[PDB]
Structure formats: C-alpha cells, structure tokens
Amino acid sequence: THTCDYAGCGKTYTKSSHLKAHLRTHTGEKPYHCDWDGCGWKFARSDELTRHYRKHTGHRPFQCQKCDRAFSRSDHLALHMKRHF
DNA sequence: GAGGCGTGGC
DNA sequence: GCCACGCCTC
Ligand SMILES: [Zn+2]
Ligand SMILES: [Zn+2]
Ligand SMILES: [Zn+2]
C-alpha cells in the first residue's frame, strides 16, 4: 500500500509511518538527537535513540527474575530466560 | 550484546 | 508518530 518511490527501490510497507522511517535510509535524515552533554549522536529512529541513551546511563530495565542478570532490552532478557530451562 | 529493522496498538 | 515487541545477523 505504501511504496518507496526513491530511485530504484520499490520496497513496500503497511503503514505510512513505516515508509517514512524507511525513507531516511535514502535521505540520511536523523531527526532524533542525543542531548547528552558533549555527545552529538543522532538517529533515524526514536527507539535507536532510546538504546543509545541506555549506553550513556547503563540503565537495564529488564531484570531476570531467576538470577541477578539484567538487560537493556526485552528480547535480550527473553533469550537469556531460555537458558534457565 | 549490539546494530538493523519490520511491525501493530495506541 | 510513539513505543516497544521481537526477529535476523553479526
Ligand atoms: Zn526505499
Ligand atoms: Zn549520546
Ligand atoms: Zn537469569
């Protein structure tokens, strides 16, 4: 339904916002800026900025309930959990 | 773990 | 558009 019309691409998406995010791969647009003092990094996706900030802060919101390990991402925790079983 | 990215409820 | 699931590849 939503087609990339940049050059020879033609990739397709189910939401306008997915296509808009995809277009940044062609334009080099990076609207999400880190505001950490002195940093300067910018990203094409908001969740990429979120991941980046967790590098700055070392915040690990996803705590394993079966051992002491914690993670910055739910998918990391999920894979780790499989190791307990 | 980290980077890239498709995706759908809101 | 945000957020955050979660898959693929390294
Ligand atoms: Zn494209
Ligand atoms: Zn930064
Ligand atoms: Zn554990």
Numbering used by the authors: 399 to 483
Paper text:
Klf4 is one of 26 members of the specificity protein/Krüppel-like factor (Sp/Klf) family of ZnF transcription factors and is one of the four Yamanaka reprogramming factors. Using a protein microarray-based approach, 47 human transcription factors including human KLF4 could bind to methylated CpG sites. Both mouse Klf4 and human KLF4 proteins share an identical DNA-binding domain composed of three standard Krüppel-like ZnFs. Klf4 contains three tandem C2H2 fingers at its C-terminus. Here we analyze the interaction of transcription factor Krüppel-like factor 4 (Klf4) with its target methylated DNA element.
A structure was previously determined for mouse Klf4 ZnF domain bound to the 10-bp oligonucleotide (5′-GAGGCGTGGC-3′), which is present in the basic transcriptional element of CYP1A1 gene. We modified this 10-bp DNA to contain a fully methylated CpG site and determined the complex structure of Klf4 at a resolution of 1.85 Å. Except for the side chain of Glu446 (see below), the overall structure of the Klf4 is essentially unchanged between complexes with methylated or unmodified DNA, with a root-mean-squared deviation of <0.5 Å when comparing 85 pairs of Cα atoms. The three ZnFs of Klf4 bind in the major groove of the DNA. As with the Zfp57–DNA complex, the two 5mCs of the two DNA strands exhibit different patterns of interaction with Klf4. A layer of ordered water molecules (marked ‘w’ in Figure 1f) envelops the methyl group of 5mC on the bottom strand. In contrast, the methyl group of 5mC in the top strand makes van der Waals contacts with the guanidine group of Arg443, which in turn forms bifurcated hydrogen bonds with the 3′ guanine G6, forming a 5mC-Arg-Gua triad. In addition, the 5mC methyl group interacts with the carboxylate group of Glu446, forming a weak (3.6 Å) C-H…O type of hydrogen bond —a common but underappreciated interaction in biomolecules and molecular recognition. In the structure of the Klf4 bound with unmodified DNA, the carboxylate group of Glu446 points away from C5 position of the cytosine, and forms a weak hydrogen bond with Arg449, which in turn interacts with the 5′ guanine G4. Superimposing the two structures reveals that Glu446 moves from the Arg449-interacting conformation to the 5mC-interacting conformation via a ∼100° rotation of the side chain torsion angle χ1.
